[PDB]
Design a protein around this ligand. Sequence first.
Ligand SMILES: [Zn+2]
Lengths: 241, 219, 329, 331
Amino acid sequence: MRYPSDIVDQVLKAGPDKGLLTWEGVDAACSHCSRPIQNGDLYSPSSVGAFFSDTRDLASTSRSICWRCVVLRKKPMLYGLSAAVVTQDGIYSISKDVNKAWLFTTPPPAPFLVVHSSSTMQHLSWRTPVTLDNRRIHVRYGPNLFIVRPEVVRKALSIADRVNEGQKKWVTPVYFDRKAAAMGHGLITRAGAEMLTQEEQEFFQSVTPGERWALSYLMHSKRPEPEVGECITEKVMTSLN
Amino acid sequence: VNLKVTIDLSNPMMEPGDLLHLDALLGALRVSRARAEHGDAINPRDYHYDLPLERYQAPSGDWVFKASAFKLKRQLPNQMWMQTGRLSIVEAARHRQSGYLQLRAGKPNPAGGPFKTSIYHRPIVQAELTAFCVGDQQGIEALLSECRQIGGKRGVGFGQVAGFKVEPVAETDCPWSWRALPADADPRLVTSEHARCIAAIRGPYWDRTLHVEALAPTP
Amino acid sequence: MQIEVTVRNITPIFSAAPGSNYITIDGTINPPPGVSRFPLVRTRMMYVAADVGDGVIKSVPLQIVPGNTMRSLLRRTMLKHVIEPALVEKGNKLSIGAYATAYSGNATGNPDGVPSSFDEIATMRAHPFIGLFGGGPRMLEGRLMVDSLYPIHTNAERILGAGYENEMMSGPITQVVWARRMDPILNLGSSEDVEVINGGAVAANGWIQDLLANSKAAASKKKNGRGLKAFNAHEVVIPGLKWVWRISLDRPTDAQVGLVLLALNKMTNERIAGGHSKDYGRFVIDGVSLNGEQVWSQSGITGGEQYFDAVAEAIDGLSSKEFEQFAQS
Amino acid sequence: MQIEVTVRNITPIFSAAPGSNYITIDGTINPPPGVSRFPLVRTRMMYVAADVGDGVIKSVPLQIVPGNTMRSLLRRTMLKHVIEPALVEKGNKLSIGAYATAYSGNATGNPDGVPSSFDEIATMRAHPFIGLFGGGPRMLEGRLMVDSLYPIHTNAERILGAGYENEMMSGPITQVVWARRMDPILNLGSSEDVEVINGGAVAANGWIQDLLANSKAAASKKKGRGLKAFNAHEVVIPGLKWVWRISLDRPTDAQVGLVLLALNKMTNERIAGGHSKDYGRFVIDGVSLNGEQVWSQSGITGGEQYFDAVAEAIDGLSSKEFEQFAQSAKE
DNA sequence: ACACCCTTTCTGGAGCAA
Ligand SMILES: [Zn+2]
């Protein structure tokens, strides 16, 4: 519940691969997940391929992967956590917009860990911190480390439901990009320029990029009700074995 | 002297995903000044705690500086910057025939590898940065006059500082606690914005090995 | 050290922007849905704060070249005109990790994360080229800040500061240039035109019948192979205007200043930010100021003798061993 | 390699600017609505930052030919005159995809997102034609860069630089040329004029009757389409001296020789458009190679190593590089 | 025998403003 690699044996039960070396000597942190490798725990020397391009998100330059993050670099872990929230009892999916509606509005009370892929297969699990508090959520989205406050998401959603109550067409006040890629991601629309007051506009610039990315999955004409995502920890474990 | 620093800047700044602490900036400027005196062959960690700021001490170890994270008064609406990393494929083939590049591979891969043409989009804000801290004004203005840019991606020229003003302020008028506080921080400094996180409270705030149980607000 | 290059783009500048931008048959950019629109790829614009016509600041569009594009352009000019001839002329050779580290700052040569002591960090930051950009597997911070290529324009004033009121461009700096791809089988007009083609008139008529079948299928669908006929637009920054470009050096050696100076001496053969087939980005350097001392002439850069001599002794001792030990170990 | 081609158009230049432009009968571009206006097809215009008055750079219009148009003119010149005769004099033939890739950079409108091998990239940039125009399904960088055709004018003095004060041009360089299409049937005069028409006077009277019915329908609309069409098009005036900048970053000697052969065969070529009005005809009065003038009356003088290189390469030219350049990896 | 290279293989949603 402290390091992102803890879910290897806390969220989902797993063990070392038994071809891993035993650490002898002084303390050194794992290159992935920033977990200190003590004396006696199993570790692997660093054998990343040339296709690994996340050297900028490595926690340390010790060139040693802890066994939990050896499990975390496995391909079934890589496509199993392409969109997943890992609570203290299981791994659930956030692929649907109703699942992100559940995650960023009334979050689960566990100290979870949120990963989401901005591409096909990405190293997501180890390079994000564990969110200890529901109010402050660390979301990994591709090369982006995002922080989402569900209270600010609730305030923006209440603002949007106020300015779009009674109207026939649900027009968004501020445009949000799902990929977080367009220039106008966070830019105020003309309808939102005419239908929001000044302090609401400064609020919509003042939100964090993670809240913008979350609102991108929950600001559209059909509004997703918070529905808990389907539990996928059985699918990941079966794939892992 | 219990003072407040405002920074106004010409280009819009690379928007920090996490908190941009004033003590982090002053520690980096002190590291640059230590590189100016004692050369480049130094440990940066011996000097970025030697700052013109007071230190708040938590009850069980875990001190923090009295600086605060920077607040943005956004003069402009937020935009997004695309940048790309591409290795020159044509120049690679020319160097591979000429022998200057010893590459045995015949075909590249934009998916992954040395020729991965990657795209990454990160936020951009023009703002005014306001921070609150308890420190000597002379050393803070010396470090900030040594400062020329603030924010991330400084190698691609983002967010050079047009100017700064450093003035004393009242004790009740400064929230310095809007800052990555320790988990056992004393509750008059822990507001509703502060929440529990795996976060650094000190020094290199990017060093995930130094990330601790922390109570931090959100930019 | 604050090198500052004032340039003038002889040809248009086209640094392409993301997103799906569209334009009508006239100059109306991004029309509402329900009118014929064409794919426009615009120049790199950023919204900047400016105080023009008022004491307060407003968001104005400023069409710039990114500092990433100028930084890699300076890097590739350095390599192509200085470093690759120096490594070639002594017979030094680069592995793929060292090549990727030197030419892209890329860490895939040693993606495990190379630990770096402070002594080798100091020697690598004192290297003539490695210390400028850094990065790669060791993730090193370079001595070089490369600003965006900012046009000397009234929207850029808060960026530019004082000293640019004269020769200051005003109004719009962009123009949409329309480009089309013609299907050249339609331009086959005689037996001599098609005699080079295998099949000849039969293959040409097969292409015509394929084009008519695809057009009829598209017309029936609108009530997936794309043809060669395309009509699109690209917004460029207009040629002939003046830009400034700031390259700051955070405590450099004289060899590093000489390397930036030698890059700027050979930079007019390079192109700023794309548009390559249309010769876009060709420019001349109107001035170079080294900490405010105007140092550029028609015959490159006069003066700065210590920097050029230091980079001469740096290039005389420039081997690929430093590059390979900066990348791998 | 820097090549600078100063030409002189002896016919008007008409590179039609896309858009919906109109003009009054008096000659005012884009009038306010209410007054009678005719369709004007303006020539292509590049906005250029120039020095109007003293030290006042402003964006002014200067009417040009696009670099894409001149690049395709250069491509089709060396294609029709050099590459295709070299392929015809031997047994080499191209597929329709290879012909399409050679003439327009691609065989299909959909490229494949995979790039090709470094060996094939290097050999295609070593090719005389494919190196200049590197297209194909896998997008190559062609080392030929082709600038727009700029008129030597005051408005391009920040474009031209020094060395262009001779044969100087100021003021407007464009003119609106009006064109009318008359109905042939109204120009019928007698039974001898109508004997070649099936039906003759009956068919002619039917044409007048449909024109009268359509005119009454148009009068009911105002207060199909006939053949009367009075309209306008703006051209760039003849006699101008133009600059054309051709650039080649580290070319093979055969490639710059191929550019030189194309510049030799620019005789009887039309620059932009307006074919039937003989627009785009021009005379090259200068070619400078890296600032060294190499043009005479009998084509390019000097530059012999480029010509021997391109002659050796055209002797070695085949269709195999064209076929495997156009061959899609997805296909 | 351990290093680089050349291939497959694999899980989900879906709306869109200037
Ligand atoms: Zn780990």
